[PDB]
Amino acid sequence: VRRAAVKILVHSLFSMLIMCTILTNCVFMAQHDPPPWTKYVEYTFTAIYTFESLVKILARGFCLHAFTFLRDPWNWLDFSVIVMAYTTEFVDGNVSALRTFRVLRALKTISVISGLKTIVGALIQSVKKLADVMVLTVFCLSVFALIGLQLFMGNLRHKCVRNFTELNGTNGSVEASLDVYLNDPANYLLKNGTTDVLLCGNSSDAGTCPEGYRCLKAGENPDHGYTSFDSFAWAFLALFRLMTQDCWERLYQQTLRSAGKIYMIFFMLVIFLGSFYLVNLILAVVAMAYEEQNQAWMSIKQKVKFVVMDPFADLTITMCIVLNTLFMALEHYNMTAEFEEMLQVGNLVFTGIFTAEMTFKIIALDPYYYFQQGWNIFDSIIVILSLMELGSVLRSFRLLRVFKLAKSWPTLNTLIKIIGNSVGALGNLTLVLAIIVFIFAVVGMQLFGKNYSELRHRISDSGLLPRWHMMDFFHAFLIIFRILCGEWIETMWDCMEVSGQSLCLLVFLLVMVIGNLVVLNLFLALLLSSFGKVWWRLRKTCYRIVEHSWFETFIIFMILLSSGALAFEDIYLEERKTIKVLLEYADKMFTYVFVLEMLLKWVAYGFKKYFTNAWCWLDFLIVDVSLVSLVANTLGFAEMGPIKSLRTLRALRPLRALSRFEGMRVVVNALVGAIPSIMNVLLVCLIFWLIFSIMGVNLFAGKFGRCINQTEGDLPLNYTIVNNKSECESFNVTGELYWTKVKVNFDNVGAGYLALLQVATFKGWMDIMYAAVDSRGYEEQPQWEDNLYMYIYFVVFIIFGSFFTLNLFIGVIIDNFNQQKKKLNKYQGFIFDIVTKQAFDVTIMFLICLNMVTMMVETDDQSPEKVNILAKINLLFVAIFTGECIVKMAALRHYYFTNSWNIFDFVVVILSIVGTVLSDIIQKYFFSPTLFRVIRLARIGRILRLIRGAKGIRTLLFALMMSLPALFNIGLLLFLVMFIYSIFGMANFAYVKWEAGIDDMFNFQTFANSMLCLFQITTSAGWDGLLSPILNTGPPYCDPNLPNSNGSRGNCGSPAVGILFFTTYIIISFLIVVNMYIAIILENF
Amino acid sequence: VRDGYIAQPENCVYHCFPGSSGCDTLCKEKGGTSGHCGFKVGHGLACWCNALPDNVGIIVEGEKCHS
Missing domain, CATH: 1.10.287 (Helix Hairpins)
Incomplete structure (x- = not known):
């Protein structure tokens, strides 16, 4: 009876029974459209679940069971699956509304494992704790959404409609108004080399259409109708996307095209603040989790003895694996036959050494007792696999031997612990x-x-x-x-x-x-x-002048001016003749002033004193490059060899500025100070990445190549006209079919490292993957999905290669910083009486809150009547605030004086009041007149400080405020790096073929343009796009020799420099942002 | 015909003052009779003097007061 049910339920055959039932259900549920044959096991599963529920109800043993025993939430779920399966089967009439619920079972394994209950419960507890920070966050997004709404309302609609709107379509039911100006996207233009309608703009900065194309604003919404800025709901979504930086490069290029180059600041403000906010919100969330944790037969015997006693074979053996790893690394896309044959022999030779050692190891030690040591067991497994491999993922089994260095390497062992830990304690x-x-x-x-x-x-x-x-x-x-x-x-x-x-x-x-x-x-x-007299006299004067503040300041101003000269060194110099001569004249003056400065330092402190400082050496190198360029010009034999290269190097003039700026100097020192600690970890990542790149080469070298005819721009039918590289050559009677490898691929270990970086950073991975998972053969054309299961390699790589290493990288940085720190008048009476009450302040908030709703309701071109009504309300509101601020301005004699914010309120209203009056010219010149009114919303934040109940908001607010000054300092360094790179980029990347990321608006051609591209790349968005034009050399895609205005000939970009330029930049920005976000955070707490 | 406040190209207003002597000269030049100034919702304070032909511009509505 009830006793028997209780006795049989807690039995441990039950947990394995139900768990097995859920597990088989998983494998059957995961199937899409299962064949009816095996399929109707479903109601047998219903039986097992119903049986379990019955047992549970009986074991509690009365009618109150469903009242006091199944109070638990996880059982409500069981009852849910029961009633739902019965509602689906016993009755229907079937519009398939319920079959969606079958998954609900899968949570039952969370109900049976005694650990997943605890974990999902604690997780939902944490969700409940992140509430108030999520409300603050949705509010911040609301505010900025309004900002984005009023700035680019409908701006993302703009489309280069073919200039048309000729005359007398009477009015518009003709394509050759809104009929064809809207619903005939055969009237629009697609962006270069894409299926995407070209935006445009009225503003001079904003990108413009080609001749014969008119920039009208009537069209469907932008990408797919899901990214339009107009209306508050869609604005909230677009801003959310910017906050999480998910594919925001695409949006930013679109809006900057429509609104103009000058609106970049908006994105710059949003990306810099939003990411800084997200980092702070994650930090707050992290603190809560941390807080929660805190709250908590004679001959054989003789032979074995000699070998075991004397060791000393690990040093020699470790060298062999290092060499082995380097041996496989040599394998590349097209190894010559001799080399190819030779490579195989080395692996065979290498396998024997390890097998021999394994045999020696088992005999010298105990075959049964000593071998049991875990490290030895895994080592033996690799050895057998290698034998099995010799007895294209088959040859990649040998790569596991690289992990043997962990015993001798402190940091690799730490990463091994993390991988082990993931499947272990955690x-x-x-x-x-x-x-x-x-x-x-x-x-x-x-x-x-x-x-x-x-x-x-x-x-x-x-x-x-x-x-x-x-x-x-x-x-x-x-x-x-x-x-x-x-x-x-x-x-x-x-x-x-x-x-x-x-x-x-x-x-x-x-x-x-x-x-x-x-x-x-x-x-x-x-x-x-x-976890003599004349010499003495000279020393005194020179020392004094350098010490004098004006001289130091003068040089500081001079360096800024010197930096400015580089900005005008772009492709338009020939056109700008007047400036060009001045720059040449200036250049000489700059070289002289800096060299004079250098000599003066020597006189003041002596050679020994001056050279000790790193910055002085840094200053010396820059002036030397310029002086060397200058001497070459004066001494003759110009315009030959590497002289152009010395000229490109003067892009380092901004660096001198870092030495004299106290903010830039402190941050730079801290970043380089931690470089040694970062360096060992970089090797571990390099080693970890080395395994994947080598593995990638076995799997993918030569598979990636795939192009078709030039006209199409994408691969040809795989199983149809061309199937092989050799076949492609045979069919190339026409010049059209070019067999071209994808830009970034694993064809060499060095090339493989680049490919991993794109995959690791998640930018540009799609092209790498499609070429990779469509690979059909060693020289064969890729088939659409042939060999689809390769995505597994990337998932394995992403989880281990990027997620674990980054976690290791974050851990060491955190560890390094901690150790480093450780190592070292009747009316007047009435207002006075009523000002004190809390309710009076609340009324103002309600009006402000209502005002937010008033701005929240406006779409683009909503109604003729609606705009007037909204405007009337908007006009009423500004008057209400002005009336309110003035009356309460002097409730008390010192009332205006007492609060700074109240004084600030007058400034926004006065700015707002003049706006409406002066609205005739303000809309064109300014972003919008209505945008100024959104500042009142910010006043609401004052109440957040006031509210007693939530401490979560205070931590986030305190964290942002405490860390606010440092964000500006890193941002300055970032800007300096952006400035340096653009100048480097301008000389190198001018005239690059306009493909991919480099369109017409975003180019490296001018300094204004270069800053925009570099800004997007700072957060890594679009780095893959920018890199691609630079990488390609030679036709079909590029042109080797195209006349250009500058001496640099052809539109092709240089690959060695291009890869070098972006990869270093992506990493430098990452170190600048990661170290500095982390250093500030550690210091703050 | 088409009448309105004191206009300004392309189509917005011109500026009055808290008083009678605001901009009487210009609008009487344009061919106006009356005098007073009232805010134009969304486009700003404007001083209407009546009986204006289509020779000089007026307050025109429908999309925005643009340039």
Whole structure:
């Protein structure tokens, strides 16, 4: 009876039974459109679950069981699956509304494992704790959304409509008004080499259309109708995307085209503040988790004895694996046959040495007892695999031997601990992330699988399956995995086209919020776990002048002026003849003043004193390059060899500024001071990346090459006209078919390292992957999905190569900084009486809150009547505030004096009041007149400080305020780096073929343009795009010799420099931002 | 015909003052009779004097007061 049910339920065959049942259900649920044959096991599963529920109810043993025993939430879920399966089967009439719920079972494994209950419970507790910070955050986004709304309302609609609107279409039912000016996108222009309608603009800065094309504003909304700035709801989404920096490079290029180059500051303000806010909000979230943790037969015997006693073989053996690793590294795309044969022999030779050592190791030590040591066991496994491999992922088994260095390497061993830790002590968290991804993958598949398959023409460019879709379970996992990376927006537009906006937004945002929350938690968990008289006279005067403040200041002004000269050294110099002569005249003066400065330093302190300082050496090098260039010009034999190169090097003039600026000098010193600690970790990443690049080469060298005819611009039919590289040559009767390898690929270990960087940073990974997962053969053309399972390598790489190393990298930096710190008048009476009451202040807030809603309701071209009504309300509001501020200005004699904010309120209203009156010229000159009124909203923040209840907001606010000064300082250094790179870029990258990231508006041609490209690259967005034109040399895509105005001939870019320029820049920015965000944070707490 | 306040190209207003002597000269030059100034919603304070032909511009509505 009840006793027997209790006795049988807590039995441990039950946990394994139910767990097995859920697990087989997983494998059956994951199937899409299962064949009816095996499929109808479903109601047998219903039986097992119903049986379990029955047992649970009986074991509690009365009618009150469903009242006092199944109070637990996780059981409500069991009852849910029971009633739902029964509602689906016993009754229907079937519009398939319920079948979506089948996944609900998968959470039952979270119900049975005694650890996943604890973890998901603590996670939902943490979600509950991040509430007030999320309200502050959604408010900040609301404010800025309004800002973006009023600045670029409808601006993202602008389209280069073919100049038309000729006359008397009577009015517009003719294509050869709004009929054709809107619904005939055969009237618009597509951007260069893309399927994307060209934006444009009225502003001079904003990009403009080609002759015969008119920049009208009437068109459909921008990318897909999901990125328009106009209306508050869509504005909130676009700003959210900017905050998380998910594919914001694409949006930023679009808006900057429409609004103009001068609106960059908006994005600059949003990206710099938003990322700084996100970093601070993550830090606050991290603190809560940390806070929670805180709250908590004779002959054989003789032979073995001699070998075991004498060791000394690890030093020699370690050298062999290092050499072995370097031996496989030599393998590249086209190794000669002799070399190819030779390479194989080395591996065979190398395998024998290890096998021999293994045999010696087992005999010298104990075959049964000593071998059991865990490290030895794994080593033996590699040895057998190598034998098995010799007895194209087959040859990559040998790569595991590189990990043997961990015993001798302190940092590699630490990374090994982190990987081990993930599946070890923190293994429960890893499992939850795995299960959550599974739940989402099947939930996503069940909900959108029908839609993706049915409407694939909508989502896809051509009549073929879309690259990313949820129809297959494997594919669904990739999309869920991709969302974890932070690239959710590109896919979200695609699902919404087929699914509809309502559903996709609910799940994708949930996946984005939940997936990131668990991934961040897992990531943070690993980090926590890881832890004569004339001569005398000369000396006195020279010493005095250098010491004098004006002289020091004069040089500081001079360096800024010197830096300015570089800015005008772009491609328009020939046109600007007047400035050109001045620059030449100036250059000589600059060289002289700096050299004089250098000599003066020598006289004042002596050679020994001057040379000790690093900055003096830095100053010396720059003036030497300029002086050397100057002497070459004066001494003759000009315009030959490397003299042009010395000229490019004067882009380092801004560096001198760092020495004399106290803010720039302190930050630079700290960054370089921590370089030694960073360096060992870089080697570990290099070694970790080396395994993947070498593995990548075995798997992918030569597979990537794939081009077709020049006209198409993409690969030819794979199984049809061309199937092989050799075949391609045979068919090349016409000049059209060029067999070209993809720009970034693993064809060499060095090339492989570049490819990994793009994949690791998640920018440009798509092209690397499509070439990689479509690889068909060693020289064969890629088939559409042939060899699709390669995505696995990238997922394995991304989890280990980037996620673990970054976690290791973050950990060492945190560890290094801690150690470093450680190592070292009737009316007057009435106002006076009523001013004190709390309610009076509240009334103002309500009006302000109402005012926010008034601005929140405006779309683009909403109604003729609506704008007037809104304007009347807007006019009423400004008057209300002005009336209110004036009356309360002197409630008390010193009332205006007492609060600074009240005085500030007068300044916004006066600015606002003049705006309406002076609105005739203000809209064109300024961003908008209405934009000024959004400043009142910021006043609301004052109440946040006042509210007693939430401490979460205070920590975030305090953290931002305390760290506010430092953000400016790093930002200055970043700008200096941007300035240096653009000058370097301008000489090198001028006239680069306009492909990919370099369009017409974003170029390296002018300094104004270079700053925009460099700014986007600072956060790594679009680095892959900018790099691609630079990389290609020679036709079909590029042109070797094209006449150019400057001596530099041809539009091709240099690959060695191009790779060098961007990769260093991407890393330098990363170190500047990561070290400085981290150093400030550590110092603050 | 088409009447309105004191206009300004392309189509917005001109400026009055808190008083009678604001901009009487210009608008009487344009061919106006009356006098007073009232805010134009969204476009700013303007002084209407009546009986204006289409020779000089007026307050025109529909999209914005643009340049």
